[PDB]
Amino acid sequence: WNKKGKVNEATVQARKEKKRLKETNQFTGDYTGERPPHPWLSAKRLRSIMTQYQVFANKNRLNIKVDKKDAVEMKKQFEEIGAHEYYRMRTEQIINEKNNQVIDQINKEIETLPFNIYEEITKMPKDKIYNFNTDSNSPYILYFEQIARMFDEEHLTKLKVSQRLQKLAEDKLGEND
Amino acid sequence: TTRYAQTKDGFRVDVGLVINRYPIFLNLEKYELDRMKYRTFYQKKYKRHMEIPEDLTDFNFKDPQMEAEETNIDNIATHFIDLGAGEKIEYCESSKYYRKVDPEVSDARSLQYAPCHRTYLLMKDPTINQYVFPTRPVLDREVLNEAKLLLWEKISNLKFQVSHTAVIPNFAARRDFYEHELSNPMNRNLKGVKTFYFIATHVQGIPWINPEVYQEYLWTPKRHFQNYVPKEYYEQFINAMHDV
Amino acid sequence: SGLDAFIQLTVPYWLT
Amino acid sequence: MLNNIFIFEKYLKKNNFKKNKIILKKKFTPLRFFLFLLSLFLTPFNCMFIISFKINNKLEINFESYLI
Amino acid sequence: DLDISNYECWRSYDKMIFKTHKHAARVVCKINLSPRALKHAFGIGSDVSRNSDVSTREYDFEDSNLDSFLLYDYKATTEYHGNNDPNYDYQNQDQVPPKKRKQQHPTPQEFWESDEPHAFRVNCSNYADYHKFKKWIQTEIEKRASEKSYEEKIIERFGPYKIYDQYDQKYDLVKEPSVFKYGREYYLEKGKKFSEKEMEENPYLKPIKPAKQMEDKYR
Ligand SMILES: [Mg+2]
């Protein structure tokens, strides 16, 4: 014996508030609780981004043509470069299989424990499982002086350095550097 | 009131460890480098990807390795000093910086035995001349992660810095029982021994282990893990190992 | 539409 | 070969999470949310074209392109 | 108007399209194909980073016009639909509610080897010639079906996949670092070298000679 359920006013307002707010926006400014960014960023530096990203969105296949001679070489280059990588990539797929088997063996055995420690392992605090902090050991740090010299260009390194100042500006991990 | 930890199957359990040090020499192939010439070249012609402005390239930058290594005494202290005309030749081993580490050595006693590949250390038993990782049993009251530290302060005595990322064990094995410990009245009702191993990573130190407990500690990578230990011990972990 | 519509909305406020 | 390095750092967390697949799952405010995408146009390891809705999202990115 | 002659595509593994959510990109078209052709005419698809519960394996292609692509399968396996029930009939045939009815679906490894067609969904960048991108594949598959499998070719070039697992074999270390081999030196334009100022202004250019294990008389 069960009857229909009536509506909550919460579902009502959300249906209506949107239509008030499709025209407006919630992202635009301190309407949202928003702190300013790292002051290394400036009004002019965003225009440096905008003025050139405005250029990238306006690109197409019709603003551009390419010579066939450049194209035919591009096959053998990126085909064989990829061929080395398919060999590399398909290994990880094979590797991760055997890695996951090892996890499956133990999870069968974790049941085969006493009462005390079996509580903790199942009921661990997520703070310990939630460690995504860096270390002195990170392959971007450990191999930095090597990798800085292995590339063909400084620009492709500048792809890394300018990338971090952004992410450092996001999590606010940069300060007065 | 001592009782070693036991299962419903009845087996005994031992905390165990595996420790490593990240390799130092990266073997970047050409095809991973060949791009970095090509994809920049074809970009300059046609420019089908976002390029950077100039106002973002004004900041100050530091090499994290340059300034931090010139203060590390392990980096600073060079074992083998000689003289020369004015400037002098020197050398350091047992350090982590990549130049001073040599591409060709044989010192399995040292960390630098194979900088290309990663390696894991092993330990001989006083009972048997066989290489195994460190182990110890656990009481009915103690905890694996607690017992993990009881082993740690035992062999290390805070001479050896290591990070402990893993809290849940990564391996598990099932051995046949010892011959020596058959005398122990505890183990005869247990009928089995398991080894839930954890993994940790070397930092900013130098290996030292109390010769009282274990002696003659060596390194090896995944592949030459064959030689130093039998096959039944080999097949357990190698599915999970990493030859970087 | 798409990513291009954040950018006329979010950015031009924080320029000032 | 860097792709072959992160297999370890990702492996150990499979044991910590008891999962076969791991993603870092950040969620950003608007300004932060755009700059994280500027990062991703300008990686040396990946050339990208990005697609999205008008609303920020819990992004699900691999650690490989992650860095600080 | 489509002409494969001047048109040229291939496969890539880092030049990609990026999504923030599964359905942010519009399904530009649909392609019906046996998966068995792809693995035989093309590489095995990489893992999924964008379509989490939907698909099982992606693909990343490119164009003469520098236009990226994607392919994937849409809810074709039990990984979304869930495993099959051996107790549920699958022959009741609309006696229970049709909304409650559930068809049987294939496992992936059974699915990928099948000759049966399946709609593969496409995503693109802005304004590519995806209509050309179809017949390229659809014709290219007609060739590579009879020719040869893609994996077996790479075993002939690079050998089988080497994981270093086997006790019976005896493997060989590697000792040469690629640092001292490679630098910007190789990848400069020929007939040129670094300015000796630039050589010193940029410390990164300064070559290194590998440290030498010097004789232990002197400690
Ligand atoms: Mg009731």
From TrEMBL, chain A:
This is Uncharacterized protein. It comes from Tetrahymena thermophila (strain SB210). The lineage of its organism: Eukaryota, Sar, Alveolata, Ciliophora, Intramacronucleata.
From TrEMBL, chain B:
It comes from the Eukaryota. Keywords: Coiled coil. This is 39S ribosomal protein L46, mitochondrial. It comes from Tetrahymena thermophila (strain SB210). The lineage of its organism: Eukaryota, Sar, Alveolata, Ciliophora, Intramacronucleata.
Automatic annotation (TrEMBL), chain C:
It comes from the Eukaryota. This is Uncharacterized protein. The lineage of its organism: Eukaryota, Sar, Alveolata, Ciliophora, Intramacronucleata.
Automatic annotation (TrEMBL), chain D:
Keywords: Membrane, Mitochondrion, Transmembrane, Transmembrane helix. This is Ymf69. The chain crosses the membrane at residues 33-53. It comes from the Eukaryota.
